[PDB]
Amino acid sequence: MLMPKEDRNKIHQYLFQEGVVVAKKDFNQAKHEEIDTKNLYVIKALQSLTSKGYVKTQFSWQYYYYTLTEEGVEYLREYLNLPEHIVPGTYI
């Protein structure tokens, strides 16, 4: 999975303030819901993050409810070079 960083980051920011992501297990639609990027981009990148202890995943009727973990946000914090204690993904 090689793909432009303008898509790697784009799902990475959108995951930060939202805290979680959903994506249908529908390959080849080329338009994710609420993200202009491709569906295959969303599924594979988060699969990479899940392998590196950052994200946890469920299948849920081929819907792939993607949710972030504690070690995920710290990696995202340095990845996006955001200020410390900027905003959480599930803040009230």
Partner 1 sequence: LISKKRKLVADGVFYAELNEFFTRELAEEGYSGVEVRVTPTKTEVIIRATRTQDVLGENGRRINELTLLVQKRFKYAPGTIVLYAERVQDRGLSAVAQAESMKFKLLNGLAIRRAAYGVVRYVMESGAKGCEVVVSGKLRAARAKAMKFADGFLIHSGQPVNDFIDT
Partner 2 sequence: ENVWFSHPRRYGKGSRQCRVCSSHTGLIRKYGLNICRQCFREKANDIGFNKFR
Residue placing its CB nearer to partner 2 in the complex, 29 or 48:
29
Task: Supply the DSSP string of 18-60, one letter for each residue.
Answer: H-EEE--S-TT----TTSSS-HHHHHHHHHHHHHTTSEEE--T
Round to whole Å and give the CA distance between 33 and 11. 11
- Under DSSP, the state recorded for 68 is E
The correct pick among 1, 3, 20, 80 for binding partner 1 (CB under 8 A) is 20
Residues that bind partner 1 in the complex, under the rule CB under 8 A: 18-20, 22, 33-34, 58-61, 63, 65, 67-68, 89-92
Residues that bind RNA in the complex, under the rule CB under 7 A: 1-5, 8, 25, 27-28, 40, 44, 47-48, 50-52, 59, 62
